[PDB]
Design a protein around this ligand. Structure first.
Ligand SMILES: [Mg+2]
Ligand SMILES: [Mg+2]
Ligand SMILES: [Mg+2]
Ligand SMILES: [Mg+2]
Ligand SMILES: [Mg+2]
Ligand SMILES: [Mg+2]
Ligand SMILES: [Mg+2]
Ligand SMILES: [Mg+2]
Ligand SMILES: [Mg+2]
Ligand SMILES: [Mg+2]
Ligand SMILES: [Mg+2]
Ligand SMILES: [Mg+2]
Lengths: 97, 116, 101, 95, 41, 55, 115, 32, 80
RNA sequence: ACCUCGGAGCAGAACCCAACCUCCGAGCAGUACAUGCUAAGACUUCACCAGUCAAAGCGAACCUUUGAUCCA
RNA sequence: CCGAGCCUGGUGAUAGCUGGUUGUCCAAGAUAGAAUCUUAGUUCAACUUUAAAUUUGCCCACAGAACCCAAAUCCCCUU
RNA sequence: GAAAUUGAAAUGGCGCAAUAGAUAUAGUACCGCAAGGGAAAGACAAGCAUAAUAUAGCAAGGACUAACCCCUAUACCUUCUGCAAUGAAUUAACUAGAAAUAACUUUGCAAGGAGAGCCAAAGCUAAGACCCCCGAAACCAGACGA
């Protein structure tokens, strides 16, 4: 019974809408534009992870460092608790030493 | 629930179809069905030895009956046929006993003659 | 194996024979030939001059799926395999004997 | 050790290792012998000579020390008059 | 080069034809199934 | 950085290196990347040989 | 303790009665053994298992030809309770290249060049 | 479609207004 | 519970003992002496180990072909 | 009562071992004050730590029982 | 529900302890010394797996291994 | 676990879709003296009935003309050295391997690599692969309670 008895409504995808059609444009902004701009400057997203990557602990540390003062109170409390938990887990748990 | 299983119906049915002829809830409930289906398949796999073993026992019983009809014992029949270089196997000898009694009579007479 | 055979009989070999369907064949290892009133016994084989048993490849099939399951309790040991064996159905067309005794 | 520090997210160096072992760049670790300064008056001259020596570590000891130090301690250092400059590299080594 | 002639022969290179170089992508091992589940290593 | 018949280069390298080794050297020809990988260290000999060939 | 067994050399000194019984001439001895494993190496010491592997007798009832020389014989002595040894008999001599593919090992221990 | 204009560095010097509270302190000193 | 030895078990043991006695006899007559056999197989043994060493030292990654890389484009081959 | 080390039983014949256990003695004493310094090659108490032996060379003369790191 | 109330928070406390740890198929895969506030754990060793390099490895015939006063073992040309 | 020093530009979803996503239809109902806790839900599965049962037994398998009768067959998981012990009425849904130091593999470039910093005596850069879930008695802080 864990199965739907009707076909789901058809999902139509426009492969040639503007977003898909122009996807990838300016990814070579650096090597084709005399390196005035780095391609990572094209990234739109959270201010604390534009052109940067890390595990959950590093992401949380960076978020606290960069926008911690602007965070809501309980969100910041949750982030502090999460950093503490992730520190304990990554530095004290695991199969490997 | 980013990724959820949608095939569980078919995964369950693959086992339930083999369980459909069981007794009780073993034919309906997957938790019980899967255990009995595994046992059924293991029995099926192991029974290919017993089929061969029982067929030879059946052939030997039938040959013993047919040869006792002619006063021979099965060891005498088999051994003397071997000594006469007749390489008929037990399946064929049982078939001859059932369906060609005169041929089996000839074989029994030959075995007794060889013995004598 | 040894097959007890007569004309028009069907025989199921549990392997492929490298023969096209409808192809005629001579079964060369005849151990026994018998009639209502007499039988001939090879020691262990009858001669080619005496008997001629001919068959025809009627079918080339696979067997029904056979399950091989292994299970050992309390060892997380469970394995399943499905095997289909090639098969050939032969029809025995004729048995001929010759007066070469 | 600390695999991810709470302030930088970086792996930390166990400074007990740095205070005790010298790493040759090729991957060898040199150390002093334990007790080389202890109660020398009751040790034979041969034992004292053995204790005064700089000694290499095992493969597994070296692997442990490599894990316990970060890549900074495993770099090429061109010190002016390093006594270990010649020992920093291996020569005529087959496998 | 003969490789470019082979390209001329072959279908168009698109985003549906791309494949990583063999040996550059190890399979991911995850703890499901008889061999990698249970006590999960 | 090999262009053209990497297999011809492999044959030439084997011919040039077998007298040195006493056996035909074992090699891998990456035709895709245009590289030739030879087991063993022969960098100096191969550099001199390619200089003689004029590359 | 259980250890390797040192068989006294008198065990392997045939008597004229043995010669008559088994039909082998001590002068001009047979060149090759046919050894078959007839007993399981399970429940036997690791050294017997190793000797069986070395002699290539892993499969039971599968004849293996070996030289009748002291080293091979020492190994065979180590595993003599697990094997059957019979001399290889060559009534027509060793096979020639022409009939190398037409040989057969008769159950009597004779390699016949016709089959 | 036509691509949006390529991203470019803002030409000339960028002088943040010191009155704004959100301008970073490093953008106000003599080093900047 | 005690166990007892049957006539069949005794006969089986006797058969095995007879086989072993024949093994003793056939092992009692070496063809060569220990001094004669010394080194008579050395050349073949050396060649066999040379083959083993060659196999051990010839291990290397297999070749890679532009044809193999480019054949993957056929996954989108259609009928026009 | 013992906990470390050494010697003997306790292992008949390379080593290892009867742990637990039995007896004994050492946390040394005597000697010398090159009884120094260096250095090939080895042993090893089944890991490591530690512990042994040592040619050649240099220099004087002309050996028989334990404890790491840190810290002072 | 007091040998020390209840609630919230620190808190996903900690647990060398208990329990659980989800597709298919193949393959390799075994008891073992030391130290340890340590014997319900761990680290090293041994074993184990994968990849790699190279050349010898196992078995062993003699010869050889103590005086005090057994079965076997070690070692290695051959094979 | 620093600092000197160095100096980043600027309306969307490879998110969930009613056990998910907020606890939320709602801090409501309900529970508590109180502080507090805190929901549910809206659009031929199991269980039965049609149709109780037939000697014998992990309930099946080999079969068979034939359901049973014949023959073979000491449930599963986990924990024990191994069988005893643990867990499981059953269905549906949910429910548990997160990552670095090196390595290895595949690219790039190569005595140099890397889009400053770093490494380099073939290295450097990039990617791929690998480190679970539930559970105490507790401790402390601040409230709430005679
Ligand atoms: Mg497994
Ligand atoms: Mg002692
Ligand atoms: Mg040692
Ligand atoms: Mg109360
Ligand atoms: Mg926990
Ligand atoms: Mg296996
Ligand atoms: Mg302690
Ligand atoms: Mg414990
Ligand atoms: Mg909800
Ligand atoms: Mg139903
Ligand atoms: Mg229960
Ligand atoms: Mg009152």
């Amino acid at each position: 019974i864990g199965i739907r008895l009707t076909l789901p409504p058809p999902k139509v995808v426009d492969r040639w809408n503007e977003k898909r059609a122009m996807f990838g444009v300016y990814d070579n902004i650096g090597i084709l534009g005399n390196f005035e701009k780095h391609p990572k400057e094209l990234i739109r997203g959270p201010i604390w992870l534009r052109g940067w990557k890390g595990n959950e602990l590093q992401r949380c540390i960076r978020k606290r460092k960069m926008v911690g003062s602007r965070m809501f109170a309980d969100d910041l409390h949750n982030l502090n608790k999460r950093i503490r938990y992730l520190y304990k887990h990554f530095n004290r748990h695991g199969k490997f030493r | 629930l980013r990724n959820r299983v949608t095939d569980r119906y078919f995964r369950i049915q693959e086992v339930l179809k083999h369980a459909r002829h069981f007794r009780g809830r073993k034919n309906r409930c997957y938790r019980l069905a899967v255990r009995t289906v595994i046992r059924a398949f293991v029995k099926c796999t192991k029974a290919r030895y017993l089929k061969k073993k029982n067929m030879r026992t059946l052939w030997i019983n039938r040959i013993t009956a047919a040869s006792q009809e002619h006063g021979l014992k099965y060891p005498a029949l088999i051994g003397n046929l071997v000594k006469c270089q007749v390489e008929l196997n037990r399946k064929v000898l049982a078939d001859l006993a059932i369906y060609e009694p005169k041929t089996f009579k000839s074989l029994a007479a030959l075995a007794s003659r060889r013995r004598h | 194996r040894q097959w007890k055979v007569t004309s028009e009989d069907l025989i199921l070999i549990g392997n492929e024979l490298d023969l096209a369907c409808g192809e005629r064949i001579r079964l060369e290892k005849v151990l026994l030939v018998g009639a209502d009133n007499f039988t001939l016994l090879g020691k262990p084989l009858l001669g080619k001059d005496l008997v001629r048993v001919e068959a025809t490849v009627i079918e080339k099939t696979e067997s029904w799926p056979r399950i091989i399951m292994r299970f050992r309790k309390r060892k997380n040991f469970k394995k399943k395999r499905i095997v289909t064996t090639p098969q050939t159905v032969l029809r025995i067309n004729s048995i001929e004997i010759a007066p070469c005794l | 050790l600390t695999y991810f520090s709470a302030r930088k997210g970086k792996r930390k160096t166990v400074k007990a290792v740095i205070d005790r072992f010298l790493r040759l760049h090729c991957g060898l670790w040199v150390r002093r012998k334990a007790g080389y300064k202890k109660k020398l008056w009751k040790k034979t001259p041969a034992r004292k000579k053995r204790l005064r020596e700089f000694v290499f570590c095992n493969k597994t000891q070296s692997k442990l020390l490599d894990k316990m130090t970060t890549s900074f301690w495993k770099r090429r250092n061109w010190y002016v008059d390093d006594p270990y400059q010649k020992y920093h590299d291996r020569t005529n080594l087959k496998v | 080069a003969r490789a470019l002639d082979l390209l001329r022969g072959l279908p168009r290179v698109s985003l549906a034809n791309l494949k990583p170089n063999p040996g550059s992508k190890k399979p991911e091992r995850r703890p499901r199934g008889r061999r990698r589940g249970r006590k999960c290593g | 950085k090999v262009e053209g018949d990497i297999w011809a280069l492999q044959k030439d390298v084997e011919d040039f290196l077998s007298p040195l080794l006493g056996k035909t050297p074992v090699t891998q020809v990456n035709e895709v990347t245009g590289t030739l990988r030879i087991k063993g260290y022969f960098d100096q000999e191969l550099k001199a040989w390619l200089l003689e060939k004029g590359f | 303790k259980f250890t390797r067994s040192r068989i006294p050399e008198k065990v392997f000194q045939a008597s004229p009665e043995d010669h008559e019984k088994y039909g082998g001439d001590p002068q001009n001895p047979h060149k090759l053994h046919i050894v078959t494993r007839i007993k399981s190496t399970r429940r036997r010491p690791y050294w017997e298992k190793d000797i069986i592997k070395m002699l290539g007798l892993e499969k039971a009832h599968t004849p293996q030809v070996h030289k009748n020389i002291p080293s091979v014989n020492a190994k065979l002595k180590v595993v003599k309770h697990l094997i059957r040894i019979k001399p290889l008999k060559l009534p027509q001599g060793l096979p020639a290249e022409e009939n190398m593919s037409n040989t057969c090992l008769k159950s009597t221990g004779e390699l016949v060049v016709q089959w | 479609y036509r691509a949006r204009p390529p991203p470019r560095r803002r030409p000339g010097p960028r002088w943040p207004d010191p009155e704004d509270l959100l301008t970073p302190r490093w953008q106000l000193g003599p080093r900047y | 519970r005690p166990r007892f030895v049957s006539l069949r078990a005794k006969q089986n043991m006797i058969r095995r003992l007879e086989i072993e006695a024949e093994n003793h006899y056939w092992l009692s007559m070496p063809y060569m002496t220990r001094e004669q056999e010394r080194g008579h197989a050395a050349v073949r043994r050396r060649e066999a180990f040379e083959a083993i060493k060659a196999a051990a030292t010839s291990k290397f990654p297999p070749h890679r072909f532009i044809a193999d890389q480019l054949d993957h484009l056929n996954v989108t081959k259609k009928w026009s």
